[PDB]
Amino acid sequence: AGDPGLVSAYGPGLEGGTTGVSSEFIVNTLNAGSGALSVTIDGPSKVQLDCRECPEGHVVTYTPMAPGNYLIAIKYGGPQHIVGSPFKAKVTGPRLS
Numbered sequence: 001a002g003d004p005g006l007v008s009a010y011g012p013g014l015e016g017g018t019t020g021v022s023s024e025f026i027v028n029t030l031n032a033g034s035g036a037l038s039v040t041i042d043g044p045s046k047v048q049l050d051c052r053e054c055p056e057g058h059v060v061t062y063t064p065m066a067p068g069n070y071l072i073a074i075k076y077g078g079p080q081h082i083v084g085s086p087f088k089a090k091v092t093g094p095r096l097s
């Protein structure tokens with residue numbers, strides 16, 4: 001159901017961020033056929049996730065609220081991870097509550 005091997009992802013949000021500030025990355029599926037994109041983010045806080053589909057691709061925004069390591073799993077057209085997933089993002093700053 002589409003080819004996860006043809007999905008690329010890039011941007012600052014894949015590597016890091018700071019608490020209470022939004023991070024962004026882009027997932028490009030344009031040559032990967034038609035399939036469902038899955039993005040999950042797991043770590044020391046539950047993040048809010050937005051995706052806006054632009055010409056350059058799926059623009060994903062999230063805001064981490066605690067410092068530490070977040071795992072960003074990106075799968076396409078089934079259970080398979082795209083190349084580089086799960087990405088580990090390191091977030092710094094105060095734990096916000």
Ligand code: NI
Nearest residue numbers: 051052053058
């Ligand atoms: Ni999207």
